[PDB]
Design a protein around this ligand. Sequence first.
Ligand SMILES: [Cl-]
Ligand SMILES: [Cl-]
Length: 210
Amino acid sequence: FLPLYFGWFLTKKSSETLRKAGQVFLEELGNHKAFKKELRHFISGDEKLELVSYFGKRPPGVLHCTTKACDYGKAAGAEEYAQQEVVKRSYGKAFKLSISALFVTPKTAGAQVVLTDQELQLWPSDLDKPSASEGLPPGSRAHVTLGCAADVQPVQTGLDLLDILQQVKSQGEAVGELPRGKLYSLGKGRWMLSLTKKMEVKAIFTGYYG
Ligand SMILES: [Cl-]
Ligand SMILES: [Cl-]
């Protein structure tokens, strides 16, 4: 049968680099003037919110960028995906993932991945498309999950990214400057840190089993 899901799994060095950059982002963001102002939109609670604790559910080991969730063949289009020539040829193969930004929402915290044309060939085209993936180029959903809220599923991270990229589609001024780049407030608890320099992480395309 098929793996739980295919994707690019970052090396140990790469994962810790991206992970630590994610922690710094949550710490810096939670301290920023603009975020403390929009706490009412980020949280309908009830005085500083520690975002690193908020996104308490983090990936236990190495970070990864998902391509296609298969659930051992139980997912729609799973069989059709794994039997592609490029998928079979790319299995166990080395890739560099380009991180363009870090983003935060009331549900998830993650990193936007800008896939190359070679890597876009590995992105699935199953018919059941998220409606937020429309008007945007394919592979826009590509991401690395950094953290989730208690009752949130990691699948949500992609949905949040697509929802964010619909807003940007463009935009106005940045509301602040962080050491790595410009910070944008997209409203409704949504934040995007556009990196001045895009991070490059090495990863291996393969299949993960439970
Ligand atoms: Cl790690
Ligand atoms: Cl997409």
